[PDB]
């Protein structure tokens, strides 16, 4: 318990109208940056509007590694996702653990010393590693989970690759955050900056989680890799919240509020690149353009990166990566597994790609003008 | 208590152990070796035809959907229209869905133009669209407000002589929906109309006992109830809910081939009661289809039974079924009508259907699945 931790817990269900004013202020950019970002966004969208096997990079990590070489020389990197989540039995959790373990050895050998920014990494889900992750007591879940995650982190340290903890349901944020803190203070993992953590901008706690993580990085000496996403579980969080009879939800209910929150949280991360490695995971060209200009003219590999999903982000990020474009790197989140393990991920991709509010749907909607696509969320909210 | 024995048998099955549910289903689903050989031949033909050849919505409005239906109706298909909408969260939403169904019935009834409930189009409704807290509110309140709304829609359907089907949703809603079916079937204001329909899900342990109740209800009500037999659209959600609820035994089967056996056993029950029910075999699985086609025997007339399929999924299969030169059996297409603002939840149920490794529509495209396996009789696997 700390002042920074208390700020997180107090924001859990803070009323939506009270969360927004500080995010709007932090998300407000100068006219000069807004004009530049509108110009860049227009160019990206005009290029775009000239453009489940699609979502899986390979059935095995050996296959996925072989298929990554082409895009790696173009300037992309990878984070591999061994598909599987919500273990319901001990045997399932054990299988998922072994898949992560064998993936780290293969990825680490493939990395061949390229390090955590130039070379590939791995993403894991805590719900794959504990048989009753959502339905068991937090103190117990962390107690059996910690040895398994630390063991994987130690393997990632051995090869100097990134290891990212994906973000799942809102009611498991606090548990996963406690695990991150223990790992960052663990002396056995010293000198390795590959530990990564996802934060979801549709959550009311997002800016306070970031404050805690930025301070944790600074006092632990770990340059925590922070993947900023908007959030993949919105419809499930709304349904759970309505069932709980709550007046105030843990997530925003208007898409524009999530967009403002993302920009505000990006500004927070870009002000802290000394101690964290921001990873801006988005397929929205307006979001990308805003962050590109917010980051300033100074750039080096390891300052920050963008990220996208395999099979979704390549049309946009082909206009970003490389010296003929914006010369900024992008890490591709690469699912690996069978069609069976793919289903839950696929469903989330459908809720993303099929929603009228999604950038990837609007970009192909003849009713949606380019002027609307480059609107600054602060000016519209 | 009225129908005590039949009602007690439904309750007893609700969470009966899976191993105990199966032996009676396996026996009733066992067919002779000759029929199995003939069904294997038909299924092989259908799959060889299949493997040798927004997608889910028929139109944004009922007018557009009705216009788009003419081509397949000319071929021998019929339609059941689904105004996309379910799980109303506000009383205003329920009233909106009611008015959507009401106006659709007028439009479908005009288009039917007196063709009747078997040759002409009908409508499908979801009770969760018509009550704002359908899953959460006490049965007394849900029944007392829902029953006048569904009766009013049924009266309009009667006035145009079209079918009106109550879709099946989550397992904990079965009891209420069945009580409503009974009250409507005994309501004299609906006399002379056989268009009331009801879905039963074969992945549920209660399915054969629900069918017993429905067949007896048809006998005592004088209504020929339309019964759509489906396997079930909510499997992943039912498993998750039962886990959360702390149940030791689930209300649905957990082995996919058990659902297949349940379906064939229940088809056998329905096919022996066609005097008082109209069976509607909703499936995209060519092996299931072939099994029922041969189970039903050589005598057929339109109105005895029909097959059904979902728009954008089943037409390639049933193009090999409808029509004199094929199997000469009718198929009713379930036709969603709406926009993105109501389409996602149906898409998700369709993706969970289409994306699952155990689904026929996935296996037909799987290179590791032989035609031998696709035509295998699931009853032999469990016998
Ligand atoms: C690119 C990427 C995304 C995600 C992850 C990694 C990478 C590289 N990551 C791993 C995969 C898990 O699914 C991850 C994600 N989400 C999550 O909760 N935890 C994780 O560990 N990833 C998905 C990500 O959150 C997001 O859903 C997509 O990238 C789409 O976002 P994007 O910025 O591309 O698109 P926009 O269309 O501008 O926004 C879509 C998002 O907006 C939110 N939304 C939609 N309606 C809303 C209403 N009515 N109120 C509030 N918020 C709303 C949603 O978050 C929606 O996804
Ligand atoms: C054709 C059709 C289908 C459905 C409906 C109408 C019509 C005309 N109807 C309305 C649409 C609602 O979503 C309806 C359906 N389902 C339902 O519960 N209530 C309804 O009112 N419809 C869908 C239908 O149930 C079904 O899901 C599909 O047709 C697919 O089944 P089909 O016979 O085509 O294909 P198979 O692939 O042989 O079987 C798939 C089914 O098997 C079950 N399953 C999957 N995993 C299982 C495990 N592990 N154990 C047990 N059973 C399992 C599921 O039922 C799965 O759908």
Flag whether residue B351 sits within 8 Å of chain A, measured between CB atoms: yes
- CA A166 to centroid of ligand 1, rounded, Å: 12
Q: Which has the closest alpha carbon to A202: A336, A65, A377?
A: A377
Each residue of B239-250: b (16+ CB within 10 Å) or e? Answer: eebbeeeeeeeb
User: Do the Cβ atoms of B125 and B150 come closer than 8 Å?
Assistant: yes
Q: B133, exposed or middle or buried, with CB in 10 Å at 0-12, 13-18, 19+? A: middle
Question: B281: Cβ below 6 Å to ligand 2?
Answer: no
Q: Which has the closest alpha carbon to A292: A74, A43, A19, A24?
A: A43
CA distance A190 to B354: 47
Structural domain span for residue A235:
3-379
Asked if B341 and A351 come within 8 Å (Cβ–Cβ), the reply is: no
* Partner residues linked to A77 by β-bridges: A331
DSSP letter for each residue of B153-217: HHHHHHHHT--EEE----GGGHHHHHHHHHHHHT-GGGTT---EEEEEETTBTTHHHHHHHHHHH
CA distance B56 to B336: 7
Distance in Å, alpha carbon of B357 to nearest chain A alpha carbon: 6
CA distance B45 to A131: 45
CA distances from residue A239 to A100, B251, B371 in whole angstroms, order as listed:
31, 22, 41
- CA A200 to centroid of ligand 1, rounded, Å: 8
Task: Choose from B132, B237, B340, B358 for mutation: most chain A CBs within 10 A.
Answer: B340
Asked if A356 and B340 come within 8 Å (Cβ–Cβ), the reply is: yes
CA distance A194 to A180: 12
**DSSP tally for chain B: helices H, then strands E:** 18, 8
SS3 of residue A278 by DSSP:
strand
The CB density around residue A323, as the number of other CB atoms within 10 Å, is: 7
Question: B221: Cβ below 6 Å to ligand 2?
Answer: no
Of B89, B243, B347, the CB nearest to A242: B89
CA distance B136 to A80: 41
Distance in Å, alpha carbon of A340 to nearest chain B alpha carbon: 6
A311: left (phi over 0), alpha (psi -120 to 50) or beta: left
Distance in Å, alpha carbon of B352 to nearest chain A alpha carbon: 7
Q: Give the residue on A whose Cα is nearest the Cα of B133.
A: A243
* Joined tokens for residue B339: 């926009």
SS3 of residue B134 by DSSP:
coil
Q: Ligand 2, residues B230, B292, B307: which to mutate, most atoms within 8 A of Cβ? A: B230
* Joined tokens for residue A312: 């979704």
Distance in Å, alpha carbon of A341 to nearest chain B alpha carbon: 9
Q: Give the residue on B whose Cα is nearest the Cα of A351.
A: B344
B259 alpha carbon, distance to own chain's centre: 14
CA distance A66 to A58: 9
Flag whether residue A246 sits within 8 Å of chain B, measured between CB atoms: no
Q: Give the residue on A whose Cα is nearest the Cα of B339.
A: A356
Q: Which has the closest alpha carbon to B167: B227, B93, B102?
A: B227
Closest residue by Cα to atom 39, ligand 2, is B359
Q: What is the DSSP letter of A160?
A: T
Distance in Å, alpha carbon of A169 to nearest chain B alpha carbon: 15
* Joined tokens for residue A64: 């996925």
Of A135, A339, A343, the CB nearest to B352: A343
Asked if B343 and A354 come within 8 Å (Cβ–Cβ), the reply is: yes
Number of domains in chain B: 1
Q: Which has the closest alpha carbon to B292: B301, B303, B305, B302?
A: B305
Flag whether residue B137 sits within 8 Å of chain A, measured between CB atoms: no
Instruction: Report the CATH number at residue A56.
Output: 3.20.20.220
Q: Which residues contact A189 (CB under 8 A, 6 or more apart)?
A: A150, A153, A154, A157, A183, A195, A222
DSSP letter for each residue of B269-319: HHHTTTTTEEEEEE---HHHHHHHHHHT-S---TTS-EEEEETTTSHHHHT
- Whether residue B284 is annotated as binding a ligand: the answer is yes
Distance, first Cα to last Cα, chain B = 37
Flag whether residue B381 sits within 8 Å of chain A, measured between CB atoms: no
- Whether residue B168 is annotated as binding a ligand: the answer is yes
Q: What is the DSSP letter of B87?
A: -
Flag whether residue B352 sits within 8 Å of chain A, measured between CB atoms: yes
Q: Which has the closest alpha carbon to B103: B60, B45, B61, B141?
A: B61
* Joined tokens for residue B98: 């009611």
CA distance B278 to B120: 15
CA distances from residue A277 to A80, A117, B225 in whole angstroms, order as listed:
18, 9, 65
- Whether residue B112 is annotated as binding a ligand: the answer is no
Question: A80: Cβ below 6 Å to ligand 1?
Answer: no
Q: Which has the closest alpha carbon to A307: A324, A294, A320?
A: A320
Asked if B347 and A355 come within 8 Å (Cβ–Cβ), the reply is: no
Q: Which has the closest alpha carbon to A38: A289, A365, A315, A354?
A: A289
Q: Give the residue on A whose Cα is nearest the Cα of B345.
A: A351
Task: Choose from A245, A354, A362 for mutation: most chain B CBs within 10 A.
Answer: A354
- CA B317 to centroid of ligand 1, rounded, Å: 37
Asked if B340 and A351 come within 8 Å (Cβ–Cβ), the reply is: no
Asked if B355 and A340 come within 8 Å (Cβ–Cβ), the reply is: no
Return phi, psi of residue A265, to 5°: -70, -30
The CB density around residue A101, as the number of other CB atoms within 10 Å, is: 14
Question: B234: Cβ below 6 Å to ligand 2?
Answer: yes
């Amino acid at each position: 318990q700390s002042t920074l931790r208390r700020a997180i817990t107090a924001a859990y269900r803070r009323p939506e109208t009270e969360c927004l004013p500080p995010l709007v202020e932090a998300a407000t950019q100068s006219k000069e940056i807004r004009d530049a970002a509108a110009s860049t966004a227009r160019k990206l969208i005009e290029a775009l509007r000239g453009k489940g096997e699609q979502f899986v990079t390979g059935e095995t990590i050996r296959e996925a590694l072989k298929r990554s070489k082409e895009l790696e020389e173009k300037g992309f990197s990878y984070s591999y996702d061994m598909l599987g989540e919500a273990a319901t039995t001990a045997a399932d959790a054990e299988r998922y653990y072994r898949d992560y373990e064998s993936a780290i050895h293969a990825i680490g050998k493939a990395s061949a010393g390229r390090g955590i920014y130039e070379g590939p990494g791995i993403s894991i889900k805590l719900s794959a590693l504990h048989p009753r992750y959502s339905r068991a007591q937090a103190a117990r879940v962390m107690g059996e989970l910690l040895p398994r995650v630390k063991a994987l982190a130690l393997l990632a340290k051995n090869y100097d690759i990134g290891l990212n903890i994906d973000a799942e349901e809102a009611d498991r944020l606090e548990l996963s955050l406690d695990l991150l803190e223990v790992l960052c203070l663990d002396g056995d993992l010293s000198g390795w900056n590959g530990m990564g953590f996802v934060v979801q901008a549709y959550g009311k706690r997002c800016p306070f989680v970031l404050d805690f993580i930025i301070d944790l990085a600074r006092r632990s000496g770990r340059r925590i890799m922070v993947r900023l996403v908007k959030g993949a579980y919105w419809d499930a969080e709304i349904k759970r919240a309505q069932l709980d009879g709550l007046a105030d939800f843990p997530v925003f209910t208007r898409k524009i509020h999530t967009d403002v929150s993302y920009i505000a949280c990006a500004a927070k991360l870009l002000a802290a690149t000394d101690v964290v490695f921001p990873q801006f995971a988005t397929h929205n060209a307006q979001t990308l353009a805003a962050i590109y200009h917010m980051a300033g003219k100074d750039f080096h590999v390891g300052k920050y990166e963008f990220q996208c999903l395999h099979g979704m982000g390549e049309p946009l990020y082909e206009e970003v990566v490389g010296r003929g474009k914006l010369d900024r790197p992008c890490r591709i989140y690469a699912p690996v597994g069978t069609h069976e393990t793919l289903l839950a991920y696929l469903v989330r991709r459908l809720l993303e790609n099929g929603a009228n509010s999604s950038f990837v749907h609007r970009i192909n909607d003849p009713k949606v003008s380019i002027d609307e696509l480059i609107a600054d969320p602060v000016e519209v909210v």
